[PDB]
């Protein structure tokens, strides 16, 4: 099959520089253009620039002329896209694409897998976890949620799982947001039979492959009222 | 500096639905439109190109059409594995640009959501913040509006929320809204609450709790 193949994801701070890579494979790797192509968090797709392999020659678009530097090494089949001093804005989906010509247009026809780069001045760390869980007299009807904040943590992500995996029904876990202090939060509920709250006990386990931490919380209403 | 204007930005349909999408370009493009497929967290498919082309490998049931400045994507008995995101592109000059999207989402009946209100920790309070959470759970559709109030007093500035996709059993979505203030802050005050408003509810719902209470 035709293939393009991405170097891995990427967690980088702002001044440094980045090279990444596309790797193609399954066809004569001069005879079809590169493009890159750029996806912001939450947004569409971007054309950065093409490099014909065969002799480098490259486009621009006029948004990324001078920002970026497309090249190829032809005798590995790979294209490249570098920054001499990356940005937090740069935080993106980086995908490169193979151009196919059909019907006297250029066609992206196939796609790499894309490679996450993640911009911050932030410092690893792994999160703190607190409970989710209502009022003493604020349970009215016969289902209640429970859950628990996962606050402070860079980078993404984490993964959250409820008693230990045995527990999936009804589970939310939202996307994390990325707060003003460059650390992201998220939260992860589950609906529960209100008449199981206190014979049946929940804990969301909390794992952060970056920080190699992981934390269990034990939710419920601590009283004092 | 070819712009290209997509609509609408998001759609609901049904399996078995005629969908269409628009693709309109700032000047002609002749028939040099092509038309990409992306799901979550995955690379782009081509679809169609030359405006009319089916590429190799997929499902008849999509089409295009158009020429010069107006194009059209059709699928013409939606599928579950089609409920995606949409882009064009045209491929006339350099350089080639793309449409904003468009996002084909599951129609379904509307549900009210249930509101839940969850007040901050005494571990979370220790180390000098607070934070309180609103919960949505799974309400249709997406538009729902979510408002905080402290001593009655709207507040402006200090939340975030974030949205699940829609749920693979019932098409719902669920939304988590969390207010931020210092402890200091957070313990001068009694009364917390969000406010929801939904198409699903026929007057506004808030759950609230008292400091001191709760
Ligand atoms: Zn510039
Ligand atoms: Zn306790
Ligand atoms: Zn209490
Ligand atoms: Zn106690
Ligand atoms: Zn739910
Ligand atoms: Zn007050
Ligand atoms: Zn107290």
């Known amino acids: 099959e035709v293939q393009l193949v991405q170097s891995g994801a990427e967690v980088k701070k702002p001044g440094e520089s980045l090279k990444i890579s596309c790797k193609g494979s399954?066809?004569?790797?001069?005879?079809?253009?590169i493009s890159w192509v750029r996806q912001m968090p939450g947004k569409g797709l971007e054309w950065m620039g093409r490099?014909?392999?065969?002799?480098?020659?490259?486009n621009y678009s006029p948004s990324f002329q001078g920002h970026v530097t497309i090249s190829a090494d032809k005798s590995i089949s790979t294209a490249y896209l570098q920054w001499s001093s990356l940005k937090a804005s740069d935080t993106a989906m980086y995908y490169c694409?193979?151009?196919?010509?059909?019907?006297?247009?250029?066609?992206?026809?196939?796609w790499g897998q894309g490679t996450l780069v993640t911009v911050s001045s932030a410092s690893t760390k792994g999160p703190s976890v607190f409970p989710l869980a209502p009022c003493s007299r604020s349970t009215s009807e016969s289902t209640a949620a429970l859950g628990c904040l996962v606050k402070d943590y860079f980078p993404e992500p984490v993964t959250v799982s409820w008693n230990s995996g045995a527990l999936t029904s009804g589970v939310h876990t939202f996307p994390a947001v990325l707060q003003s202090s460059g650390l992201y939060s998220l939260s992860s509920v589950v609906t529960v039979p209100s008449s199981s709250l206190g014979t049946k006990t929940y804990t969301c386990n909390v794992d952060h492959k970056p920080s190699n931490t992981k934390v269990d919380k034990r939710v419920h209403h601590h009283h004092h009222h | 500096d070819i712009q290209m204007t997509q609509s609408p930005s998001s759609l609901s349909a049904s399996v078995g639905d005629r969908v269409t999408i628009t693709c309109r370009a700032s000047?002609?493009?002749?028939?040099?439109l092509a038309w990409y497929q992306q799901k979550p967290g995955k690379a782009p498919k081509l679809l169609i190109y030359?405006?009319?082309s089916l590429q190799s490998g997929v499902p008849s049931r999509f089409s295009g059409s158009g020429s010069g400045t107006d194009f059209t994507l059709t699928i013409s008995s939606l599928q579950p594995e089609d409920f995606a995101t949409y882009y064009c592109?045209?491929?006339?000059?350099?350089?080639?640009?793309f449409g904003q999207g468009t996002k084909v989402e599951i129609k379904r009946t509307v549900a009210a959501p249930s509101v839940f209100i969850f007040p901050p920790s005494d571990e979370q309070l220790k180390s000098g913040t607070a934070s309180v959470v609103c919960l949505l759970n799974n309400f249709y559709p997406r538009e729902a509006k979510v408002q905080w109030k402290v001593d009655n007093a709207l507040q402006s500035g200090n939340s975030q929320e974030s949205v699940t996709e829609q749920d693979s059993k019932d098409s719902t979505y669920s939304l988590s809204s969390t207010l931020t203030l210092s402890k200091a802050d957070y313990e001068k005050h009694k009364v917390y609450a969000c406010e929801v408003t939904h198409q699903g509810l026929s007057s506004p719902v808030t759950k609230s709790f008292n400091r001191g209470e709760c």
């Open positions: 694409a193979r151009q196919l010509y059909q019907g006297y247009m250029d066609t992206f026809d196939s």
């Open positions: 030359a405006a009319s």
């Open positions: 399954g066809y004569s790797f001069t005879n079809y253009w």
């Open positions: 592109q045209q491929g006339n000059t350099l350089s080639y640009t």
């Open positions: 490099i014909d392999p065969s002799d480098s020659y490259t």
């Open positions: 000047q002609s493009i002749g028939l040099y």
